Amino acid sequence: SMEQVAMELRLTELTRLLRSVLDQLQDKDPARIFAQPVSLKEVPDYLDHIKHPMDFATMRKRLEAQGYKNLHEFEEDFDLIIDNCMKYNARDTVFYRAAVRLRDQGGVVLRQARREVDSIG
Incomplete structure (x- = not known):
């Protein structure tokens, strides 16, 4: 169904955003402890x-x-x-x-990511 595909496009877009979030979070761990x-x-x-x-x-x-x-x-x-x-x-x-x-440092990134998810839906 087309409804199923549109949900899948939303999941994919969330995934792309979360990948950028994840990279940013991981740059706050330059020692690579985590x-x-x-x-x-x-x-x-x-x-x-x-x-x-x-x-x-x-x-x-x-x-x-x-x-x-x-x-x-x-x-x-x-x-x-x-x-x-x-x-x-x-x-x-x-x-x-x-x-x-x-x-x-992660809290700043997550603060704005929450606005970007709400905002873009």
């Missing part, structure tokens, strides 16, 4: 601590299969990256401090 999943070879107990791991590569795979239906879904995943890190790592670590910075 680029890849936490290794279970190098932190074998990780899953006793964190129930829903997330990282930029896993968000990117989900994005390219058009797996984000709206911005809320994307934001939940971004917030997981941050919130996982601030629980697992202590306050005085390079990791925790990098989360705080990504959160603060």
Whole structure:
């Protein structure tokens, strides 16, 4: 149906926008601390601590299969990256401090992306 196609064009356009958002968010992590999943070879107990791991590569795979239906879904995943890190790592670590910075710098990007999604529909 033509209705089905039009929904698919909206999903595709959301996907393009989210990809630009994702790149911008990832530029706020020049150390690439959040680029890849936490290794279970190098932190074998990780899953006793964190129930829903997330990282930029896993968000990117989900994005390219058009797996984000709206911005809320994307934001939940971004917030997981941050919130996982601030629980697992202590306050005085390079990791925790990098989360705080990504959160603060990412909030500006997400502020305007929410206007762009509402605005463009």
